[PDB]
Design a protein around this ligand. Structure first.
Ligand SMILES: CN1[C@@H]2CCC[C@H]1C[C@@H](NC(=O)c1nn(C)c3ccccc13)C2
Ligand SMILES: CN1[C@@H]2CCC[C@H]1C[C@@H](NC(=O)c1nn(C)c3ccccc13)C2
Ligand SMILES: CN1[C@@H]2CCC[C@H]1C[C@@H](NC(=O)c1nn(C)c3ccccc13)C2
Ligand SMILES: CN1[C@@H]2CCC[C@H]1C[C@@H](NC(=O)c1nn(C)c3ccccc13)C2
Ligand SMILES: CN1[C@@H]2CCC[C@H]1C[C@H](NC(=O)c1nn(C)c3ccccc13)C2
Ligand SMILES: *C1O[C@H](CO)[C@@H](O)[C@H](O)[C@H]1NC(C)=O
Ligand SMILES: *[C@@H]1O[C@H](CO)[C@@H](O)[C@H](O)[C@H]1NC(C)=O
Ligand SMILES: *[C@@H]1O[C@H](CO)[C@@H](O)[C@H](O)[C@H]1NC(C)=O
Ligand SMILES: *[C@@H]1O[C@H](CO)[C@@H](O)[C@H](O)[C@H]1NC(C)=O
Ligand code: NA
Lengths: 205, 205, 205, 205, 205
């Protein structure tokens, strides 16, 4: 708490805050999902609720420091409201996402930030076939809402969704879960937008 | 990050916020709807729920700059709470509108602002006949709540609601989707009032 | 915009906020209701849901200005948070009232304020007989919570509830809707309180 | 209004907020309840919902003033957020309480404060026998959450619950309703613990 | 109350905010659960709702003080927002935890802090067999969300969950309730994490 108080002051109070990436200084955000449980399936309205962890990672020069000047501190924890965060969001949610975890990020001396919110999400899915052997497939896109591919690019560290914390006695079993970076060119806008596509095939019991 | 900080502070920290339009200095807000899905139909209460993107566009002289002065930044993204926004509301909602996307807008050097919140709206519609071949038509009007057409004029770039992102496997099919500007030279108050009427015709299957 | 910025700064940033009325300087608030729809009837809990606009009007000398001193501005819109508002509330709600419109008010140069929040309200009503030819009668009264008649008085411009914007395809037809000034005395307190009684008789179909 | 603003400035700005009661300077909170309706009874979850008013009264020397020094002002109204309030909490709630009235308090020149929030409360109650003629009895205790009897004392003005505003067409019929101060000493601690027990016997029709 | 104001001002305002523990200056959080009721069991979504109090205890050296310098004050109550708090969270919640008690803590002159918030938690649990004589078992982990064992270790003053406040007329009786410290090693990280595993076996009637 000696040099850690002095470090956080030198980063947040003295210096201004990141106003977000630009075309001249773009940013790459790494995205990884941890599927925990499929909680609800509404066939009357086509809604499916997921509980998942959202791994987000990015790096800013204006967060870097030299450990030898701050008690050999390599990393720290702080409120996610102390730093800038990307506007990563689902394209087809039907309700406001609810947050299940503390909003705290980890900041490392290279300027890399690690932020992993646990969330609950209702989204659009016709769940017809979930009670069959073949199951049913759903998909929901995640990406920046207002920044283009020239300002925020996405990447994944793997095409496989982490299922190592999927709830055992879940009403549903996961057949396949894949997260896949796409580059989307919409008819509305001259700039492309980049998303990671969370695709899940699943079935009952 | 260097020129953008200076730009954001010159625009926001060096002038009081735009107090809004007046009779002498009216404003034109362009409006457009993207129907993503019809999410709920209640024939017992006559409530229908929509998920849509509401595109709002306007231009302010006080938000103009010369890029040459700012490292040739032509546009930037900022929190919607940094800038003035129009009081566009649905005239027949039954529940508070729920925001599904980040509250971020796009400001351009010409002074223009693009703001597209994704939203869930519950409004008044008798869905009787939805299970017929002919379907049922709902309608909901959007406009400024407190500004007359003398301060805020409305406008659409097209009469057709954007259906390019409509849920491929939706519970309902859209038969027609129109967005129409309407002007009341009388609405219980001696003053011209303007709305954009959203008319949606749809049926089950 | 230059003059309006100045008027608002002069009103809101150079004088302490109005501390509300007192016995020595009372206030009269005008109240009117516009019934848009009866959205829910629950005979198992005796709750009825209304959607209405509540019109509130009052005058403060501390909001007066001479137009000549400010570009001939005669009136402007501002956030309701910028001004004092009366604590008018429904007496028999069963759930927190929900606001459906922007919290913005019109201020006029003579010091008059017009504030019209659209709302959804759940209140105590036994709807027994609503499917009868005669119908059922519900009532909810609205008043200040902590200001007596010596500090806040209420009046109405008409005794008839505005039904000109009632949903044409509502589940319920309105047989009569009145709004009446009433003096209430409580056992706890000597001072009388003033409210406005909203009486609505309606039926199905 | 000049004297009021001056008085408010003197109480809330020329001084720090009351840090709360201590063992050297204890405080007595008078508690009284007003039952308005019993709105929900869930026999499967053992939850009952009340709509009631919680009357709290205490007196601070720091809130005293001589009316002669302030143009004869003997009392005023002000947002509950401007002053300290006791942590009177229900001990067996199942859900967060929902506020139904404005949060304004009345402050009298003797330093006394009167604060009466209207609330919807969900609490633990096996309602078995509510349809019988003997009905059912439910109870919920109210007191400080973190202050012992050494810091906050509780007191009632009467043992009868105010039924003068009980909903006339309520689904239920109140057989008895009492509010009783209770003290429980413990062998580990010299500090007593104080609560007011709200006991309601009721039945259908 | 004069001494208390000066104490709180010396500890909070004339001192930098505690930045949380590190590898160098780690922290031990003592954890305890008082179970009040099992309020909901959903067998179609595998969700169980608990209401409980969560006793948190820890000690900062930065919150120590000499009572002799501040009028023999041994402890005081203050908002949980005035001080740093551990990010203890449930690992398998399905909805945001709902706080039922005031967010106030107690700080002792030795620097120790006791924080006991009442809560409603929804978590993943297959309730299959609850209506049987053997009953059913649920488990939920609680621990820091961003800190490892190096920064935060957990402790329990006992291994039995307090059932002395369990609702007597509950829909369910408890068969066993344990709170047991566990040390994990998730594959993502080379550092260990501490958690306390609340395990509850129970049944109807
Ligand atoms: C990820 N985001 C980007 C692409 C679409 C969804 C969001 C919002 C944002 N959308 C848009 O900018 C957008 N959408 N429509 C239908 C338009 C029509 C005309 C002009 C702009 C737009 C950009
Ligand atoms: C966009 N807005 C304008 C047009 C109607 C919808 C909203 C509400 C606003 N309403 C009104 O201003 C309004 N309404 N009633 C019944 C009144 C009676 C007397 C004076 C004013 C009003 C006007
Ligand atoms: C409209 N108002 C609401 C809140 C305060 C003033 C009035 C009267 C009423 N509340 C009262 O103030 C009130 N009620 N009871 C039973 C009391 C007992 C002692 C002192 C005051 C009261 C409700
Ligand atoms: C207001 N309070 C009451 C209700 C819950 C919150 C607080 C905590 C309080 N509990 C106590 O602090 C408590 N209880 N027992 C049996 C003890 C034995 C030794 C030391 C402390 C306690 C109970
Ligand atoms: C369960 N966890 C959460 C809460 C604390 C213990 C652990 C550790 C912590 N972080 C992680 O869970 C975590 N980190 N990375 C890089 C991951 C990659 C894939 C899956 C999970 C993670 C948060
Ligand atoms: C508390 O403070 C007083 C004042 O200085 C001190 O003299 C005394 O030791 C303490 N209390 C007792 C035991 O008198
Ligand atoms: C755009 O502005 C930049 C400022 O660095 C300038 O270097 C550049 O010349 C400008 N564009 C043109 C016309 O080259
Ligand atoms: C307002 O209007 C009057 C009359 O038209 C005009 O003479 C005066 O200059 C105006 N004041 C301002 C500042 O616009
Ligand atoms: C209160 O002020 C008025 C004068 O404005 C006067 O009637 C009265 O004397 C004053 N109070 C007392 C106690 O005199
Ligand atoms: Na009243």
């Amino acid at each position: 708490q000696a040099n850690l108080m002095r470090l956080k002051s030198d980063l947040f109070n003295r210096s201004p805050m990141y106003p977000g990436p630009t075309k001249d200084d773009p940013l790459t955000v790494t995205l990884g999902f941890t599927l925990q449980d499929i909680v609800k399936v509404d066939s009357s309205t086509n809604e499916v609720d997921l509980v998942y962890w959202e791994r987000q990672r990015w790096k800013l020069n204006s967060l870097m420091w030299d450990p030898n000047e701050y008690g050999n501190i390599t990393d720290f924890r702080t409120s996610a409201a102390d730093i800038w965060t990307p506007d990563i969001t689902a394209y087809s949610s039907t309700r406001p996402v609810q947050v299940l975890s503390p909003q705290i990020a980890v900041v490392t001396h290279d300027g890399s930030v690690m932020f992993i919110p646990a969330q609950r999400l209702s989204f659009m899915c016709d769940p017809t076939g979930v009670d069959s052997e073949e199951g049913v497939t759903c998909a929901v896109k995640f990406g920046s809402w207002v920044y283009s591919g020239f300002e925020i690019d996405l990447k994944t560290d793997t095409d496989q969704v982490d299922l190592s914390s999927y709830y055992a006695s879940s009403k549903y079993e996961i057949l396949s879960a894949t997260q896949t970076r796409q580059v989307q060119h919409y008819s509305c806008c001259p700039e492309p937008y980049i998303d990671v596509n969370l695709v899940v095939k699943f079935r009952e019991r």
